[PDB]
């Protein structure tokens, strides 16, 4: 039985449904930053491909990552959905953003195809955290 | 004109062709570790989705990442090709491996759909390295 804190806004998501099916014990809180907290250091920010693209368009992505890093020593970003075929932005803009966050800011960016996969990632990371704590 | 060192085995790849089209000046060397060296600290390991899966099956992925980290302070892994629909392995095995490399080992894992995209990533990172050096 792994324990994960979930931000109130994610409560009725399909991610939460899968986490519950996986046996995760969820504690609800309204977080200023982050969507799923695994430990005092590990926090996960769930972001749809569309919202990632929008944050690049509006130039707010880096402020977002900064806020995550300042709140957690080991933040993780799970980008959910395909980033391909999503016009309104040159591929280099998306690639450049990804490279900046992962290599410069040092914040891992794990890609998920569905909310279920996002839950599976949260679950496996939380399980490792529990076993290693 | 950005400069990148490329391992001899990558010389006739489509990645090298695109890098040359992008104006990158390549110096060929036979590297013990890594495929493309951007700086004394930044090195890139190009790995096909199939080879990543195989390394998980044979349990050699972590040794590979260890070798990269010991050779470069800021290594990067570019996984080229789709990891979905590639049976012979449960999705959790791939997810778990990705999470371990990016979160535990702290080695960024950038996903590329083609050798051309891999070149575009190498190029943009190398350009930033040059501008910031
Ligand atoms: Ca979110
Ligand atoms: Ca390689």
Coordinates of N, CA, C and O and ligand atoms in Angstrom, one line a residue, chain B residues 10 35 45-47, ligand 2:
Chain B
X10 N 29.0 6.3 -36.3 CA 27.9 7.1 -36.7 C 28.1 7.9 -38.0 O 27.2 8.4 -38.5
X35 N 28.1 8.8 -28.5 CA 28.1 8.8 -30.0 C 28.4 10.2 -30.5 O 28.9 10.3 -31.6
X45 N 24.2 9.9 -26.2 CA 24.2 8.5 -26.6 C 22.9 8.3 -27.4 O 21.8 8.5 -26.9
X46 N 23.0 7.9 -28.6 CA 21.9 7.6 -29.5 C 21.5 6.2 -29.4 O 22.4 5.3 -29.6
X47 N 20.3 5.9 -29.0 CA 19.8 4.5 -28.9 C 18.5 4.3 -29.5 O 17.5 5.0 -29.2
Ligands
LIG2 CA1 24.4 4.4 -29.7

